[PDB]
Amino acid sequence: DKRNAEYRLAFEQLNFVGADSKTPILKSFIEDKGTRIDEITFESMIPIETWKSYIPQLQTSLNISIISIEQGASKRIVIIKSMAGDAKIPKYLPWDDKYIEEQEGVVVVGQTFSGNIKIDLNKSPHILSAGETGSGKSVILRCILWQLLKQGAIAYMVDFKGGVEFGLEYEKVGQVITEVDAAEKLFKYLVDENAKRLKLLRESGSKNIGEYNKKFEGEELKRIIVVIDELAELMDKTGVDDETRAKLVRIEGYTSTLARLSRATGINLCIGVQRPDAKVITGQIKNNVPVRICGRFADSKASEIVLSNTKAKDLPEVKGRFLFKLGADTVQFQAFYFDDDKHFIPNKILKLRKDEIEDK
Numbered sequence: 001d002k003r004n005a006e007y008r009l010a011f012e013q014l015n016f017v018g019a020d021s022k023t024p025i026l027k028s029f030i031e032d033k034g035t036r037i038d039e040i041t042f043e044s045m046i047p048i049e050t051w052k053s054y055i056p057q058l059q060t061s062l063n064i065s066i067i068s069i070e071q072g073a074s075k076r077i078v079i080i081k082s083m084a085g086d087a088k089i090p091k092y093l094p095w096d097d098k099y100i101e102e103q104e105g106v107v108v109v110g111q112t113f114s115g116n117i118k119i120d121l122n123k124s125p126h127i128l129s130a131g132e133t134g135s136g137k138s139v140i141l142r143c144i145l146w147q148l149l150k151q152g153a154i155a156y157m158v159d160f161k162g163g164v165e166f167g168l169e170y171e172k173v174g175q176v177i178t179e180v181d182a183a184e185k186l187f188k189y190l191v192d193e194n195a196k197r198l199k200l201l202r203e204s205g206s207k208n209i210g211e212y213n214k215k216f217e218g219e220e221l222k223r224i225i226v227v228i229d230e231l232a233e234l235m236d237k238t239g240v241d242d243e244t245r246a247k248l249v250r251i252e253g254y255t256s257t258l259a260r261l262s263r264a265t266g267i268n269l270c271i272g273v274q275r276p277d278a279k280v281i282t283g284q285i286k287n288n289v290p291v292r293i294c295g296r297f298a299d300s301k302a303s304e305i306v307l308s309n310t311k312a313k314d315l316p317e318v319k320g321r322f323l324f325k326l327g328a329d330t331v332q333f334q335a336f337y338f339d340d341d342k343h344f345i346p347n348k349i350l351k352l353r354k355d356e357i358e359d360k
Helices: 002-014 048-053 055-062 139-150 180-204 209-215 242-264 283-288 300-306 346-357
Strands: 025-031 037-043 064-071 077-084 127-130 154-158 174-177 224-228 267-273 291-294 321-326 329-337
Touching: 002 025, 002 055, 048 055, 048 064, 048 077, 055 064, 127 139, 127 300, 139 154, 139 224, 139 267, 139 329, 139 346, 154 180, 174 180, 180 209, 180 224, 180 242, 180 267, 242 267, 242 283, 291 300
Parallel strands: 127 267, 127 291, 154 174, 154 224, 224 267
Antiparallel strands: 025 037, 037 077, 064 077, 291 321, 321 329
16 A cells, blocks of 8 residues: 555646546556566546656656556556666676576577566577667677577678678687678578478478477587678678679578578578668568667667667667667667677587587
């Protein structure tokens, strides 16, 4: 009843009253400790639209973070999907190998208010990390790569800045693609590999490699992970000769093909973008890339591309503070500080690899 009287007061203050002078009466307070989110229900004579416009006034009074105001059973009943006003988000989040998931295909990206953000690459298969230069953006992808490498995945890194963001260390664990020629060979291969895989899956009678891999263990399908340091490196023809203009288009057709058909076959794309543009994050790419990571952008246009809303502006001036987006919802999180010197250890991967081959 402490919560009932604390609301009664906040409403009483805001003069938040119905057509009947009656303030909103509290009905249920569902304390989901697991999700740190609470289902607060009120019966009032105040239409949802009016609760919706008064959301900032409510938030500040009741010290809460409202997510949604869904209408309940009747027009007078309204459920406020909302979490605490003491939003538990870290200052700096250092990486630790303890976070590596045992569920093959799952990757942690950082910590939200409740807990660590997980991603099932069998559910949502491709990641788009956008953020201006001044770090963060790619560090999230390199961190994801490490997790999958540790889960025994096959890596392909794509870096046209002559393989600078993926050093000789990364070349120990996989192929680093630095030019249009290799990028063409590669994206063509992956497309043919995805093709060979859809055959095996269909015939085995499995919907994804998660299913298929529970069915075959001696010979399993290795997950393929494709990191693209910068997309615009591939996504910009504006200058090249006819021969190259063709290659970059061929590459645009393969990327589109994989992005649209991969989910089942275990071929995952992680894309970095320093500045969103519709000529870079094209139709297909955005259409087929579920996960969206967004950095502090002062441009509303850039936010609309990736997040398809303008929440990137509203981010705090903290390094690692990003916005994860899957489906409709968007959360504020501190990503892991992944240092390629201390955290990336190629030997550990070569170890797993010797250890897996020293069987069958």
